[PDB]
Structure formats: structure tokens, C-alpha cells
């Protein structure tokens, strides 16, 4: 279970410091830069880098008030087909939000494929 999310984020951060383990962006460093930029500079910063691939809805929230969870998430290293898996620390990793969303979107298709193959 990932429900104990604060705890898990902080434990993974002790080792990974908000660096995506798939694409190696330093998502925490971008968070801090955005947080401390004036709102009026945030849009151009976000569209100049890997965050440009996030949903417009999320990017609008990030311009108003960025939070750490907009930039990186903890997720499984070995997920089950369709999502889930063991939530022990040795099966967890930092993903930037763009990688996390690709993974989530893939797992929703996988859940589709599972439902299909059993109808
Ligand atoms: Zn990434």
C-alpha cells in the first residue's frame, strides 16, 4: 500500500533526493526553482523543460502554487501488470511526474487488456 505517502516520500528522498530513477531529471531542484520564482516567470520556466509534457491543468496549478508532488512521486520498481505491487521500501523509487503519468496511463491500458482477455 502507498497510502502512508508522506512517510514513504521522505524515506525514498533520503536516498534519491527527488531525482527520477528512469530519466534522471532532478525534479526536486526544479520544484525549488519554481517555488521561489515570481508567479509571472513560472509559465516560461515550465514550458522550457521536461514539465512541458504535463497536463495543462497541472501546469496551471504549478504556476499558481507549485508543490513537491507536482514534480515527483514515489512509485513501484516492480509493479504488477495493471498496477500495484509490494510497497516495501526496497520496491520503491522516485519518478518525475511525467514518467509517473506515462506509467499510470500504461497501467490503465493494461487493466483494459486484462478485462478484455477475461470477458
Ligand atoms: Zn522521469
Residue numbers in the entry: 1 to 119
From the paper:
Cellular responses to replication-associated DNA damage are centred around Proliferating Cell Nuclear Antigen (PCNA), a DNA clamp that acts as a processivity factor for eukaryotic DNA polymerases. These include the amino-terminal SNF2 ATPase core, two PCNA binding motifs (the PIP box and the APIM motif), a specific type of zinc-finger (Npl4 Zinc-Finger, NZF) and the HNH nuclease domain (named after the three most conserved residues). We have previously identified ZRANB3 as a structure-specific endonuclease that plays a role in the replication stress response. We further defined PCNA as a key regulator of ZRANB3 function, which recruits ZRANB3 to the sites of stalled DNA replication and stimulates its endonuclease activity.
The HNH structure contains two HNH molecules in the asymmetric unit that are structurally similar, with an RMSD of 0.76 Å over 117 equivalent Cα atoms. Each HNH molecule contains one two-stranded anti-parallel β-sheet (β1–β2) surrounded by eight helices (α1–α8). The structure adopts a ββα fold, typically found in the HNH protein family. It also contains a non-catalytic zinc-finger coordinated with four cysteine residues, conserved in a subset of HNH proteins containing the C-x-x-C dyad14. Analysis of the electrostatic surface potential of the HNH domain revealed a predominantly electropositive face, with a continuous positively charged region encompassing helices α1 and α8, as well as helices α2 and α3 in the ZRANB3-specific helical domain. By analogy with the T4 endonuclease VII structure, we hypothesized the involvement of Asp1020 and His1045 in metal coordination, and the role of His1021 as a general base in nucleophilic attack. Although the mutations did not have a dramatic effect on DNA-dependent ATP hydrolysis, some of them either substantially reduced (N1036A), or completely abrogated (D1020A, H1021A and H1045A) ZRANB3 endonuclease activity. This is consistent with the proposed catalytic roles of Asp1020, His1021 and His1045 in the nucleolytic cleavage of DNA substrate.
